[PDB]
Ligand binder design. Structure first.
Ligand SMILES: [K+]
Ligand SMILES: [K+]
Ligand SMILES: [K+]
Ligand SMILES: [K+]
Ligand SMILES: [K+]
Ligand SMILES: [K+]
Ligand SMILES: [K+]
Ligand SMILES: [K+]
Ligand SMILES: [K+]
Ligand SMILES: [K+]
Ligand SMILES: [K+]
Ligand SMILES: [K+]
Ligand SMILES: [K+]
Ligand SMILES: [K+]
Ligand SMILES: [K+]
Ligand SMILES: [K+]
Ligand SMILES: [K+]
Ligand SMILES: [Mg+2]
Ligand SMILES: [Mg+2]
Ligand SMILES: [Mg+2]
Ligand SMILES: [Mg+2]
Ligand SMILES: [Mg+2]
Ligand SMILES: [Mg+2]
Ligand SMILES: [Mg+2]
Ligand SMILES: [Mg+2]
Ligand SMILES: [Mg+2]
Ligand SMILES: [Mg+2]
Ligand SMILES: [Mg+2]
Ligand SMILES: [Mg+2]
Ligand SMILES: [Mg+2]
Ligand SMILES: [Mg+2]
Ligand SMILES: [Mg+2]
Ligand SMILES: [Mg+2]
Ligand SMILES: [Mg+2]
Ligand SMILES: [Mg+2]
Ligand SMILES: [Mg+2]
Ligand SMILES: [Mg+2]
Ligand SMILES: [Mg+2]
Ligand SMILES: [Mg+2]
Ligand SMILES: [Mg+2]
Ligand SMILES: [Mg+2]
Ligand SMILES: [Mg+2]
Ligand SMILES: [Mg+2]
Ligand SMILES: [Mg+2]
Ligand SMILES: [Mg+2]
Ligand SMILES: [Mg+2]
Ligand SMILES: [Mg+2]
Ligand SMILES: [Mg+2]
Ligand SMILES: [Mg+2]
Ligand SMILES: [Mg+2]
Ligand SMILES: [Mg+2]
Ligand SMILES: [Mg+2]
Ligand SMILES: [Mg+2]
Ligand SMILES: [Mg+2]
Ligand SMILES: [Mg+2]
Ligand SMILES: [Mg+2]
Ligand SMILES: [Mg+2]
Ligand SMILES: [Mg+2]
Ligand SMILES: [Mg+2]
Ligand SMILES: [Mg+2]
Ligand SMILES: [Mg+2]
Ligand SMILES: [Mg+2]
Ligand SMILES: [Mg+2]
Ligand SMILES: [Mg+2]
Ligand SMILES: [Mg+2]
Ligand SMILES: [Mg+2]
Ligand SMILES: [Mg+2]
Ligand SMILES: [Mg+2]
Ligand SMILES: [Mg+2]
Ligand SMILES: [Mg+2]
Ligand SMILES: [Mg+2]
Ligand SMILES: [Mg+2]
Ligand SMILES: [Mg+2]
Ligand SMILES: [Mg+2]
Ligand SMILES: [Mg+2]
Ligand SMILES: [Mg+2]
Ligand SMILES: [Mg+2]
Ligand SMILES: [Mg+2]
Ligand SMILES: [Mg+2]
Ligand SMILES: [Mg+2]
Ligand SMILES: [Mg+2]
Ligand SMILES: [Mg+2]
Ligand SMILES: [Mg+2]
Lengths: 238, 159
RNA sequence: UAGGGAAUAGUUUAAAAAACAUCUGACUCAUAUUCAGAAGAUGGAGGUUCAAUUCCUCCUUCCCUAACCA
RNA sequence: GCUAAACCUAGCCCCAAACCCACUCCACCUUACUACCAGACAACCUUAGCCAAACCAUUUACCCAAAUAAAGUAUAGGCGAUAGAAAUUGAAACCUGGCGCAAUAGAUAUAGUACCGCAAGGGAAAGAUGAAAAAUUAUAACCAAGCAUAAUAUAGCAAGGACUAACCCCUAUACCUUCUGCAUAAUGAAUUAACUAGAAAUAACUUUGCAAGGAGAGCCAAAGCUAAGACCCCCGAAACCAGACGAGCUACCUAAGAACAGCUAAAAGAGCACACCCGUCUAUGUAGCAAAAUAGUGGGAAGAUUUAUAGGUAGAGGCGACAAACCU
RNA sequence: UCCUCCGCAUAAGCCUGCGUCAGAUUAAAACGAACUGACAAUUAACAGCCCAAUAUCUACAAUCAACCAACAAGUCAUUAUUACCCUCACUGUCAACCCAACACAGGCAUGCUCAUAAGGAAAGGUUAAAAAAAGUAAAAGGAACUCGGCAAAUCUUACCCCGCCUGUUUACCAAAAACAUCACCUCUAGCAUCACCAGUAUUAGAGGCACCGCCUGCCCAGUGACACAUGUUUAACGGCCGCGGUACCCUAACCGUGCAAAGGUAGCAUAAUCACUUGUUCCUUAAAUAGGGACCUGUAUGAAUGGCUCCACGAGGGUUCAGCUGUCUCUUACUUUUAACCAGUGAAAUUGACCUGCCCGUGAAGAGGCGGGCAUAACACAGCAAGACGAGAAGACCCUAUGGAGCUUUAAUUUAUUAAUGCAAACAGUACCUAACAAACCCACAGGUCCUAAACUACCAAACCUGCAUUAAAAAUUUCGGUUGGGGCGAC
């Protein structure tokens, strides 16, 4: 078929971008994922997940001012417009992030551990053990891919041989280099999981189509399974 | 592309079966062309090259029906054209080396006119012939000025 | 009407044994519990085999299943 | 007396021979037949199945480069059905013909047109004077069913025996198929015209030729061998496989649009109620107005609503708030 | 005079398809003409047909946008420099029109008109039978009708079952108690440049169940899944007991004994729950196989393939008060349509031939056609539906066929394919191994002589691809014997 991904924009902007729905279809036009369709129209606000991105001609730690915290239709967590120097960008808001606050984006790992302020971005090596973190990256400079959902938080468990052990929201441990940057605190919208849909219609507004009416006998996969926590996932190469 | 009997028993199901060769990407050096090529080959190709004592010998010795490669046939034409022309572009600054290489492979040398057509497909050959034969038409002005002058000269003799 | 299974001591099981119940004794002031003893059985009939709960056959009692389609 | 009837051409079939192949100007791969702008996608990849094997599961002939012969031999094979060589052998070869059709035949063909289908695709019918029509009051007639001229008189497979006499008298249970057996109230048939269904080996028999030989290389032969004559139907499934064509209906989705009075509450997958969407119940209709409608009555009607436009998903599949729904 | 269901316009579709003249070809009737030949016609301002480059810019809905309050978070915006002197071409424009084989009571988007200024005609003429259709009115009674208050009239009470609710489905016999659904729960997954998602476990996907309220008991032996050392797991597939005796009889708190992974718990119960069955009792009726409340061992109820209550809701199924009524007692009158007659036009199924009676008997077993009787001049028109085993569809029930197909699977055959694992293939190198001891003697030490001081290499290249195996997943191909007082079951 003639499917073209809407994700064609190449330059970062804070202007909400028009996005196109998939209906759960793939590029071939056949349904690939069921239960997707319709819903309210939405515009995409480009989120910058690399908190330590110095301006073009700048280097080192820098501060930003929170302009606004607002609803994002494309994700569970709220997003914050931050401005520093001559640059404005969208980022994921923390639990207590509000307009007028100042946040610190540093890459410095010092002998002593810093006093962790909620919403600040530091390297994992610079944070005290037990700090609640979010928006963690697997490798340095890769950008945050973990602990992004509303209310989610990880904890820094250990710091050994230039590496950091963090507990993921699923409780599985994650070893990374101590230079990987994370954000302090919990993600915004802590009460997301307490929301009540209330009626079938509201699920339709969210772009969710009803389940199939076909009755499926349950098989061996079903039933409670008590399994050990998976072994620590490591991204450091020795 | 063929069929097999399951468990090598004719009384069992006949199944489709495709056997594919194991492919390897290797780098080869041509002495006549003084260039390195990254060619996808099979272990049989490596054995045949070893038995020929080099890529140049393999390309020049192997007939078209055994090479089974348009790229191989193009390499053959390239090598043969350099041998036919005794091209000085091979090691331009080392005439002695250039002449040892050409001597090593002198048995395969052929006239240049023939070498230009080696390995060409019928479609390529037709296009090459078409280009050779493509000439702008001659203005009839020139042709008629030749019949006239030639005719006037003959008339003068009779006078 | 058709089909499969079962029958063991008074009771319930086992592959001719245990358990209690029954009777005998001891312990108790007496009873029970307990301890030591004792007895008791292969639904019925017919046949094979030296020998048949254990190989077959018919009958009785009982149980379970089926008894449909227009 | 009407309706009709009648016709001999158009061309066509099978061979032979010969290799084959077009052109004014203009337009035409975008929505073809559209004068005039920035692109760059590019071709190859084992047929399957019906069917036969009385199922079916391995297997089941399909020109592949010289007629004949070797030979249905070697050989292959659920060693079944059936399949099947080669060495070797080695011929003839002058297009302009027909114990072919003649308008239901022969090409589907007056034409791939009309018409049918969204598309791929399916696919017709028919003409008839004469030397002259610048001879048209011309070229007579007689012939199927159907009628008309000309309705009918007790009683009966409709006739037969008869009779002076149509009827009245006497005798008589249409036909085909199918069956143990059919007037059967078992099958088919309004009627006319045309069309519409028995193809060949193995042997044997019969009649010629020659004869321990026969035959115009091959083969057979302990009277054989050569040649000839003479025997083996038609229509019909539900299916299976391959390659194309289809989402202008409908299912779901994508892009960007549109509609929703009045009243109540004013918060609403809230109520009443138009437009609009749906289709509960009854009657009507049932070759209908309609291959699903009409009248009334009903459910919903700011929502998971309804709807116009363009696009997407394709059959070993799609799509589905699973009804085995829907995909012209 | 009477209708107005409309109407006008645009879009889409269609393509000259009721303009003139000339033809008598015709509109399901008719000489006007939508049919034929010729000749005319729609004129752009509406609409279509658009735009130089590169970089750069674009957080703050809409709703009278102002108060107010939201979520499902939204249709409208640039600058910088460079380049650029030119003008009104081309195409749509008609109609009584499109999709439905038709001049089809159907289908058909938007604007305006909200009943009309626009658009139209239900009766060819007559008669005023039956049957039939659509209406209006009806004495007394008022559901006595009927499967049922269907229909009609009037316009209301209470209750029960199921499903929570709005919603969804078999286009064309089922709209429902079936599906979905908020909620609850189980399972899988630690991650980016084409779905999921420009998302990241408060997430995403695969499922079950079905809001809420009280709850969801016992079982991991078997199957499955997972996990490996045993094992874990039921809101996974599923399961959740006997025999004999003891208070007169019923029953057994009780007692013996066997079995099992556990022995059905709470609840509820004659149920939409195999029969028994119209179970018993109270209420309801003059009378109840109905309905409601209870009793219940249901030996075949029962707890997320959910149990039990309960608001609201339902064209779901059942019962009922009151009213209402031609539903009925029991029908009647009138109007319209149809009808019949006249005129025009003019189909379909059907049809062996018919000179096409009744009775009894007979017969391939139900006779207009045969036997014995009886009846009998000929031919229309209107009714009727007892027969012509009436017409329509080569019975869909049933059986048969070494005929099909859909579906399921622990039917046979197979793993080509997909995934996993193993080996081979391919591909670089890093390391090569130590448990004396003097007993005697020597030697300044440090150590030596004798009574052994040998022999001996290990590891080892991650993926991708190819070949060969193994296990899975998901599929493919094919079959489902016969006999039989029909087949099945039994038996053979
Ligand atoms: K959100
Ligand atoms: K068959
Ligand atoms: K024809
Ligand atoms: K017949
Ligand atoms: K009969
Ligand atoms: K009969
Ligand atoms: K019949
Ligand atoms: K489409
Ligand atoms: K038109
Ligand atoms: K209609
Ligand atoms: K309904
Ligand atoms: K288990
Ligand atoms: K009851
Ligand atoms: K009762
Ligand atoms: K309902
Ligand atoms: K009748
Ligand atoms: K019988
Ligand atoms: Mg989203
Ligand atoms: Mg669900
Ligand atoms: Mg379900
Ligand atoms: Mg067969
Ligand atoms: Mg068969
Ligand atoms: Mg040969
Ligand atoms: Mg013809
Ligand atoms: Mg005649
Ligand atoms: Mg007579
Ligand atoms: Mg018979
Ligand atoms: Mg007879
Ligand atoms: Mg008959
Ligand atoms: Mg018959
Ligand atoms: Mg024959
Ligand atoms: Mg087959
Ligand atoms: Mg196919
Ligand atoms: Mg469409
Ligand atoms: Mg959309
Ligand atoms: Mg409104
Ligand atoms: Mg509502
Ligand atoms: Mg409403
Ligand atoms: Mg739907
Ligand atoms: Mg179903
Ligand atoms: Mg079904
Ligand atoms: Mg304009
Ligand atoms: Mg107009
Ligand atoms: Mg509609
Ligand atoms: Mg008017
Ligand atoms: Mg009228
Ligand atoms: Mg009328
Ligand atoms: Mg009339
Ligand atoms: Mg009355
Ligand atoms: Mg009654
Ligand atoms: Mg009443
Ligand atoms: Mg009655
Ligand atoms: Mg009613
Ligand atoms: Mg419901
Ligand atoms: Mg239906
Ligand atoms: Mg529907
Ligand atoms: Mg219905
Ligand atoms: Mg349900
Ligand atoms: Mg619940
Ligand atoms: Mg449970
Ligand atoms: Mg007693
Ligand atoms: Mg209980
Ligand atoms: Mg019952
Ligand atoms: Mg009643
Ligand atoms: Mg049960
Ligand atoms: Mg149950
Ligand atoms: Mg279960
Ligand atoms: Mg509610
Ligand atoms: Mg109700
Ligand atoms: Mg509803
Ligand atoms: Mg009549
Ligand atoms: Mg008439
Ligand atoms: Mg007939
Ligand atoms: Mg009779
Ligand atoms: Mg009559
Ligand atoms: Mg008859
Ligand atoms: Mg009949
Ligand atoms: Mg039949
Ligand atoms: Mg078959
Ligand atoms: Mg068999
Ligand atoms: Mg049989
Ligand atoms: Mg029988
Ligand atoms: Mg049997």
């Amino acid at each position: 078929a003639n499917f073209v991904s809407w994700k064609s924009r190449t330059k970062y902007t804070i202007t909400p971008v028009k996005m196109r729905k998939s209906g759960g279809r793939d590029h071939t036009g056949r349904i690939r994922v069921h239960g997707i369709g319709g819903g309210h129209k939405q515009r995409y606000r480009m989120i910058d997940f690399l908190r330590f991105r110095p301006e073009e001609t700048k280097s080192g730690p820098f501060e930003e001012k929170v302009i606004q915290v607002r609803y994002d239709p494309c994700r569970s967590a709220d997003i914050a417009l931050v401005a520093g120097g001559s640059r404005k960008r969208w980022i994921i808001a923390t639990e207590n992030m509000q307009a007028g606050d100042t946040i610190l984006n540093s890459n410095h790992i010092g002998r002593m551990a810093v006093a962790a302020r909620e919403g600040d971005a530091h390297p994992l090596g610079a944070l005290p053990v037990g700090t609640l973190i979010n928006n963690v990256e697997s490798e340095p400079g890769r950008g945050a891919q973990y602990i992004r959902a509303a209310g989610t938080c990880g904890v820094l468990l250990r710091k050994v041989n230039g590496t950091a052990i963090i507990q993921l929201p699923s409780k599985r441990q994650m070893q990374v280099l101590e230079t990987c940057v994370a954000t302090v605190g919990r993600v915004s919208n802590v009460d997301h999981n307490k929301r009540v849909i209330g009626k079938a219609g509201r699920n339709r507004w969210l772009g969710k189509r009803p389940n199939s009416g076909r009755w499926h006998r349950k098989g061996g996969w079903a039933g409670r399974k008590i399994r050990p926590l998976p072994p620590m996932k490591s991204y450091v190469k020795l | 592309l063929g069929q097999i009997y399951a468990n090598n028993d004719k009384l069992s199901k006949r199944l489709k079966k495709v056997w594919k060769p194991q492919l390897f990407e290797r780098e080869f050096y041509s002495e006549i062309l003084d260039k390195k090529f990254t060619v996808t080959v099979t272990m049989r190709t490596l054995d045949l090259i070893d038995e020929a004592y080099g890529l140049d010998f393999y390309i020049l010795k192997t007939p078209k029906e055994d090479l089974c490669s348009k790229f191989g046939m193009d390499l053959k034409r390239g090598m043969l054209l350099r041998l036919a022309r005794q091209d000085p572009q091979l090691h331009p600054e080392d005439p002695e080396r250039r002449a040892a290489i050409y001597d090593k492979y002198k048995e395969f040398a052929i006239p240049e006119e023939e070498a230009e057509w080696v390995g060409l497909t019928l479609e390529e050959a037709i296009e090459k012939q078409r280009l050779l034969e493509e000439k702008d038409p001659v203005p009839l002005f020139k042709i008629y000025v030749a019949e006239l002058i030639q005719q006037l000269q003959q008339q003068a003799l009779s006078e």
